[PDB]
Paper text:
The known anabaenopeptins B, C, and F (1, 2 and 3) were isolated from a culture of the cyanobacterium [name] and tested for their inhibitory activity against [name] in an enzymatic assay. Compounds 1–3 turned out to be potent inhibitors of [name] with IC50 values of 1.5, 1.9 and 1.5 nM, respectively. The comparison of 17, 3 and 14, which only differ in their R1 residues, demonstrated that Lys or Arg side chains were associated with high potency (IC50 values of 2.1 and 1.5 nM, respectively), while the Tyr residue led to a decline of activity by two orders of magnitudes (IC50 of 400 nM). In addition, we obtained crystal structures of the complexes of anabaenopeptin B (1), anabaenopeptin C (2) and [name] (3) with the surrogate protease [name] (CPB). We used CPB crystals grown in the presence of ε-caproic acid with space group P32, since these crystals had wide solvent channels, which allowed the soaking-in of large inhibitors like the anabaenopeptins. After soaking, the crystals diffracted to 2.0–2.3 Å, enabling the calculation of detailed and accurate electron density maps. The general binding modes of 1–3 were found to be very similar and in the following discussion the complex with 2 is used as an example. The linear part of the anabaenopeptins, which mimics the carboxy-terminus of the [name] substrate fibrin, deeply penetrated the active site channel and bound in the carboxylate- and specificity-pockets, while the circular parts of the anabaenopeptins were positioned in the entrance of the channel and completely blocked the channel like a plug, thereby preventing other molecules from entering it. All hydrogen bond donor and acceptor atoms of 2 interacted either with hydrogen bond donor/acceptors from the protein, or with bound water molecules. We found that the C-terminal arginine or lysine side chain (R1 in Fig. 3) bound in the S1’ binding pocket and interacted with the side chains of Asp255 and Ser207. The R1 residue was bound in the S1’ pocket, which is specific for basic residues like arginine and lysine in [name] and CPB, while the S1’ pocket of CPA is specific for large apolar residues like phenylalanine and isoleucine.
Numbering used by the authors:
A (entry chain A): 6 to 188, 188A, 189 to 308
B (entry chain F): 2 to 6
Write the structure that this text describes.
Amino acid sequence: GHSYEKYNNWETIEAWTKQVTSENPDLISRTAIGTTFLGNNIYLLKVGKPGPNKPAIFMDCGFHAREWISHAFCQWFVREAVLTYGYESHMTEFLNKLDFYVLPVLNIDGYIYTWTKNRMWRKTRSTNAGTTCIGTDPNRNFDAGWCTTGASTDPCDETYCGSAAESEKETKALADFIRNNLSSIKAYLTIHSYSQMILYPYSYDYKLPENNAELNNLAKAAVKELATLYGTKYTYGPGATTIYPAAGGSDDWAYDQGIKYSFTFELRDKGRYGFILPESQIQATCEETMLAIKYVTNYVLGHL
Amino acid sequence: XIYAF
Ligand SMILES: [Zn+2]
């Protein structure tokens, strides 16, 4: 069955999205924002106490198939939201004043594949013209300096940027949903591993966002809150100089749509286990990440 | 998450 303490396969995660919404209709509603290449449903959980014209924070997990602690965290977040609402004053104020759009797994097809065939798969599972090589890197497929740097035009590479921007059903679906909801989404958070980083734009170029100083201080403060629990050390900064130049990412794209608070989160660890983080580390990773997420939420709330 | 950075 489903556990928050273990990695769950897609069948279990899908059944969980229905069940947790079913058990908490007062705090959660579910939709799909599109389907994947292989016809799976890209679910989105709207977490919050329903009200007219509320602002929102958008968070996705599972961009990259093999980064399983990412998927894990979205599920953890949702449970913590429903558990502490009415019991922990901050989360209670958060759910009352805004919504969280939580997209638990974006790249469902790749995720299934990491379970069925290849644990180290990263990309989507779509076919490509002129080759047998499979998949596009969803985080190289967004219309942000698309395919100009840090991406590959070779479908056989794990940073393949796609035949065109948003060529992928999954990424077009995410981009469509965000455009269509631009006026309410105030922050964009996308969960990855591993590196222990909080990154903001830009990555597709060395330029800096006009609110660079704000973004940097918020990341700084977030990294601090995160450390308070277990002393886990994160680093922070513009993607381009903080890890590497890479075009077509969703964080940069979201920011250029006008969402001023845009962050990629790289969770545990720093390489000892890498993508194959032991399940015994799930709870600790998620707990400390919550503090960073909640700090940002609080900040966004006082800067509407 | 690109290998091997
Ligand atoms: Zn990643």
